[PDB]
Design a binder for this molecule. Structure first.
Ligand SMILES: [Zn+2]
Ligand SMILES: [Zn+2]
Ligand SMILES: [Zn+2]
Ligand SMILES: [Zn+2]
Ligand SMILES: [Zn+2]
Lengths: 329, 185, 263, 109, 265
């Protein structure tokens, strides 16, 4: 199944006063922001080439809290600042989606444009009908996958299914974590989706040539002090503090080899290991994965290496490591 | 009675808060206004605004209309539906039934109320297994006779634990039940 | 507390090459130095715990899950178990000419899941700061890059420090690996004096590493190359499916077979 | 979906039926076999129409002389339109099963 | 309409950096400023959108020998019983009307990932295997064999700052702001110069603007070295050469692509 490795995602947060209601254990808005910080960090950790943008909608107006960027810390700071937001007004799906569409219209065709609307207040007061905007969204192939809160909104249901996204409603906080963690992963590319080669640039960390001879002093490029060494660009030739980042001049993505390598596990998903409770002639008391005695009647095995893994080993392998230790051999 | 309750809520601030939380529509005797209000109510249900449709149990709208998924999700019954005890036509209809076929006047009156309530509250389960809750804001329904005369399918689901929930407890259990029904099969 | 894991690269081909050369350094002395390091690590504190893994071309095996000489019983048990198991593993081994490169990614994966198991079992009251003191001894294999990168990223997410101690060779992949997770990288040129390097550079834990002077990190060359002839390239043309660094613009990348549309 | 009802075999368009549908069909067949007027209640607004229509059609096929025709009445024309839709779906399913047209007529006044 | 003048007035003082750089491009009289822009309450509002009758009443009763407080006062001001229900129905309808204003993947070569971009007899294995097998028949030599004092002292000396494996200035402050400002100017103009440079753009109207921008490169780099000269003749310390690389590399790209265009022609 074709997958879009590079995706520009907009997490549309609503500053409705329905968010004031403390349905969850803490305030709803505070919980959403606290978990969305984790979502942002994990999304960047699972898709370095991708970038994210936050639009906060309240009082019938949508404001770009943070533009598209490759730096998780800046977005995290924006979330922490927004934690104290007043949270009064009424959202406008038309306004939010129009802002997202305006920013995403000029984005490259190859990248997957995606929107995740964390809908809290079921109402949607908009200057213009949203069914018309749905047509433009379908034309622009911008995937929109709403996540409703305490409501199965019909307009958002049709939005999701027509635009190709998925609709969900929060059963509880634990299920909210699961929903956002699921949305972290790249979505499969459908027939409407198209792939195209994208120019990429690989910089190399550089320092003073020899005892600060013919040095290359520079401060930064988006109170930066002088830097003896740092990253550079093949074309900008402008010092960059951290990678990966889009060029401020070229418009070309600067990214190192490990960042790309971080996404190969998506292309290579791990086949689920059959769960057999009984020992099944497994005379090895120690679990091969962790070399620990199997204290539970559960075993996992591959179709190639035919090794033995306990519950923790299998869960960790399929969750984070994304590869079978013994089966690597 | 609906007009009196609406007027009292308007004098108090409850009605304005309800308007803020969700759109409010009301039924009237005139069929044209009823149809227009219901047409707008359907669009409100489709959109995220939502709608609160106040109607009368004997209203032709109640019998004609059918509520399905994402339509009339929570059916609220304000008071046991009883016809006015002054309309002399029902007096003949009722005392004649007492004289012949031997039906108690109170028995037939409660039957006429329970049948009407079941008619006007049984729409949410139309088909396709679409979730929905039926809340009856009246302690009279808690009486054994009303429960017994209630249809079997609703009554068996009904339990003593939730029989006489307070307003707040009913709200909490409704929220929890909606949470449970939100998730897929 | 601290959970240390020593991933020793005991490659029979290279260590036996040393034995044939009759050089001063030997695998026996390397194992003794690693043993002393583990003993000192546990010596640091009771709560501290350690484990050992040995790497071989075929697989990797754990070397670790009275006072006859007046010795501490726990460290005596460690000495006996590691000595016996390492001798058994080295003595018994099949021969496969096709596969001779040392295996390290699988050993590191085993270490990572072992650390996860210990972190799950340990009480939540005490926080565990695990570390992996990888000790390479032979050149790495090209075919292991992908899996090694997977395990390195898993370690980064799980907050484990990969302290590399390569000797006799500078593995660019391993230095890249430890750079990602912030682990130290020391290239000891004096093999006989290796243990002094452990008791200074590696032995101190992450808690005290910041407040201590240690050798500066080595510059890491994050090179990129096209999949054709294997050479450094500064500009890569990747697609949206393969995510592969290529040579030059082509109508369709071979590893994709996609119907790229010109424009 | 052919259900081996106690009385006979009855076709059914949808894939599965709840146990309440089995109870409904058996009680209805009992009433028809007794050939006596009766009353019964079923919760679902929809589904009862299809089950009732299928059982009546199967009973007509088994004992055409017993029942001359079915007179199915509904409250309102907008509602009876849904009934005729259900009957059309059932007839299409039965026609596909049989492979040919049969002398069956159904209409709404 | 003087929309450009209005925008310039709006951004004249609201944003300091934008106007600072736009003015800087003219301070030395580099180029015309045309290309610069060529290339680049609640309650009353709710009532306004809610009640069209109130809108018409406001239009007809615009303040004239009256007061807004009086206008506010005019707002709140079985026959009445039905009026309330009708009013809610109409008001909700008006609010709603206002809100409704008009591929399975397949691959042929997977080992390329197994050996990614990272770059790079028989009897020898047998000999090494047997020798290493016979190596460790003796164990636990730690007492003296593992380490020696001379080697330990050599290791400590190496770890010393002057030893092997251990190799071992914010004086200017005001110059920092000037360097930052110059870098921002370079970035601003390089943005437009590189906006369409990578794309071939084999069209007449597309190439005209790259030619104009290429000339603008000469014209801006004409003035950059004069400020460089002013800064240089202060102490001849802490050389600033990174700026030179950007200009020289832009010139190299310009000339190389010009030669390539001539070759293509
Ligand atoms: Zn650049
Ligand atoms: Zn295990
Ligand atoms: Zn396996
Ligand atoms: Zn090539
Ligand atoms: Zn490809």
């Amino acid at each position: 199944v074709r997958l879009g490795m590079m995706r520009h995602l907009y997490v549309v947060v609503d500053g409705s006063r329905t968010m004031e209601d403390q349905d969850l254990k803490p305030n709803r808005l505070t919980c959403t922001l606290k978990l969305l910080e984790y979502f942002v960090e994990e999304y960047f950790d699972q898709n370095p080439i991708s970038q994210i943008g936050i639009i906060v909608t309240k009082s019938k107006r949508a404001e770009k809290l943070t533009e598209l960027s490759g730096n998780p810390r800046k977005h995290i700071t924006s979330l922490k600042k927004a934690v104290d937001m007043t949270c009064h007004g009424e959202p406008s799906l038309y306004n939010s989606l129009s802002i997202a569409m305006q920013t995403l219209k000029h984005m490259p065709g190859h990248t997957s444009r995606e929107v995740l609307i964390i809908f809290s207040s079921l109402t949607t007061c908009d200057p213009s009908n949203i069914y018309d905007l749905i047509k433009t969204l379908k034309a622009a192939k911008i995937r929109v996958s709403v996540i409703g809160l305490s409501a199965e909104v019909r307009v958002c249901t049709v939005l999701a299914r027509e635009t190709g996204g998925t609709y969900h409603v929060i059963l509880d906080e634990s299920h909210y974590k699961e929903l956002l963690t699921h949305h972290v992963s790249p979505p499969p590319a459908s027939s409407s989706s198209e792939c195209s080669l994208i120019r990429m640039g690989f910089p190399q960390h550089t320092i003073a040539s020899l005892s600060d001879q013919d040095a290359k002093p520079s401060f930064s490029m988006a109170e930066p002090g002088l830097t003896l060494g740092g990253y550079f660009c093949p074309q900008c030739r402008a010092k960059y503090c951290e990678l990966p980042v889009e060029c401020k001049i070229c418009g070309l993505t600067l990214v190192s080899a490990p960042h790309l390598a971080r996404s190969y596990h998506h292309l290579f998903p791990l086949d689920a290991f059959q769960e057999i409770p009984l020992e099944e002639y497994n005379g090895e008391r120690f679990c091969y994965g962790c070399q620990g005695e199997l204290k539970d009647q559960h075993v996992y095995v591959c179709a190639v290496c035919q090794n033995v893994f306990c519950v923790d080993c299998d869960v960790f392998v399929h969750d984070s490591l994304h590869c079978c230790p013994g089966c690597i051999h | 009675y609906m007009e009196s309750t609406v007027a009292s809520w308007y004098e108090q601030g409850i009605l304005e808060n309800i308007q803020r939380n969700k759109l409010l529509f009301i039924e009237t005797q005139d069929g044209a206004e009823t149809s227009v209000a219901l047409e707008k109510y359907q669009e409100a249900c489709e959109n995220g605004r939502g709608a609160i449709l106040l109607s009368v149990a004997r209203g032709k709208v109640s019998e004609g209309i059918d509520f399905v998924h994402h339509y009339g999700r929570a059916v609220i019954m304000f008071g046991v539906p009883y016809v006015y005890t002054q309309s002399r036509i029902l007096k003949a209809r009722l005392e004649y039934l007492r004289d012949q076929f031997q039906i108690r006047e109170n028995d037939f009156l409660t039957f006429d109320a329970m049948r009407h309530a079941a008619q006007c509250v049984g729409r949410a389960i139309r088909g396709k297994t679409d979730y929905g809750l039926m809340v009856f804001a009246d302690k009279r329904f808690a009486r054994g006779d009303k429960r017994g005369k209630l249809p079997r399918w609703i009554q068996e689901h009904l339990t003593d634990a939730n029989l006489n929930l307070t307003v707040d407890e009913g709200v909490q259990v409704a929220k929890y039940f909606l949470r449970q029904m939100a998730q897929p099969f | 507390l601290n959970l240390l894991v020593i991933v020793v690269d005991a490659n029979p081909i290279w260590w036996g090459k040393q034995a044939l050369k009759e050089s001063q350094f030997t695998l026996s002395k390397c194992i003794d130095a690693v043993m002393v390091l583990g003993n000192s690590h546990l010596f640091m504190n009771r709560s501290n715990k350690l484990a050992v893994i040995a790497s071989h071309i075929q697989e990797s095996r754990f070397l670790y899950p009275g006072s006859k000489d007046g010795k501490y019983e726990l460290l005596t048990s460690a000495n006996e178990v590691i000595v016996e198991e390492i001798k058994d593993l080295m003595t018994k081994s099949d021969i496969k000419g096709q596969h001779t490169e040392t295996l390290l990614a699988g050993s590191l994966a085993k270490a990572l899941c072992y650390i996860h198991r210990m972190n799950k079992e340990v009480k939540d009251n005490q926080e565990m700061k695990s570390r992996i003191l990888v000790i390479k001894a032979a050149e790495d294999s090209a075919l292991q890059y992908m899996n090694f990168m997977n395990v390195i990223f898993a370690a980064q997410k799980q907050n484990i420090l990969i302290d590399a101690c390569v000797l006799d060779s500078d593995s660019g992949l391993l230095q890249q690996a430890c750079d990602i997770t912030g682990g130290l990288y020391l290239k000891v040129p004096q093999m006989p004096s290796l243990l002094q390097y452990l008791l200074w550079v590696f032995l101190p834990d992450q808690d005290q590493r910041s407040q201590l002077i240690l050798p500066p990190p080595v510059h890491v060359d994050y090179r990129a190359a096209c999949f054709c002839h294997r050479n450094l390239i500064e500009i890569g043309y990747v697609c949206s499916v393969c995510l592969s660094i290529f040579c030059n613009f082509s109508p369709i990348c071979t590893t994709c077979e996609t119907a790229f549309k010109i424009s | 979906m052919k259900l081996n009802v106690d009385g006979l075999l009855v076709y059914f368009p949808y894939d599965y039926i709840y146990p309440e549908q089995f109870s409904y069909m058996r009680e209805l067949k009992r009433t028809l076999d007794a050939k006596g007027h009766g009353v019964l209640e079923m919760p679902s607004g929809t589904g009862k129409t299809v089950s009732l229509l299928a059982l009546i059609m199967a009973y007509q096929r088994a004992y055409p002389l017993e029942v001359t025709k079915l007179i199915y009445c509904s409250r309102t024309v907008p509602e009876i339109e849904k009934v005729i839709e259900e009957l059309r779906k059932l007839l299409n399913f039965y026609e596909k099963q049989e492979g040919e047209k049969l002398p069956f007529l159904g209409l709404a006044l | 309409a003087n929309k450009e003048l209005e925008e310039k007035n709006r951004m004249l003082q609201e944003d300091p950096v934008l106007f600072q750089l736009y003015k800087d491009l003219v301070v030395s009289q580099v180029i015309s400023a045309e290309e610069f822009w060529a290339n680049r309450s609640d309650i009353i509002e709710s009532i306004f959108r809610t009640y069209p009758a109130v809108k018409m009443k406001y239009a007809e009763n615009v303040p004239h020998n009256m007061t807004e407080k009086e206008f506010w006062t005019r707002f709140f001001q079985e026959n009445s019983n039905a009026a309330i229900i009708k009013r809610f129905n109409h008001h909700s309808a008006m609010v709603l009307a206002a809100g409704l204003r008009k591929i399975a993947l397949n691959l042929k070569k997977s080992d390329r990932y197994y050996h990614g971009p990272t770059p790079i007899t028989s009897q020898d294995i047998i000999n090494s295997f047997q020798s290493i097998r016979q190596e460790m028949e003796a164990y636990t030599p730690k007492l003296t064999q593992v380490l020696s004092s001379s080697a330990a002292s050599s290791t400590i000396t190496a770890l010393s700052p002057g030893g092997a494996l251990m190799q071992g200035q914010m004086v200017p402050n005001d110059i920092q702001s000037e360097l930052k400002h110059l870098y921002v100017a370079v970035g601003e103009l390089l943005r437009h110069f590189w906006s369409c440079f990578p794309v071939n753009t084999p069209f007449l109207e597309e190439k005209v603007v790259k030619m104009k921008s290429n000339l603008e490169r000469f014209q801006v780099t004409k003035l950059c070295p004069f400020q460089e000269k002013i800064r240089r003749q202060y102490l001849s310390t802490n050389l600033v050469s990174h700026i030179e690389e950007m200009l020289q590399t832009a010139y190299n790209k310009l000339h190389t692509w010009q030669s390539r265009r001539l070759m293509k022609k």
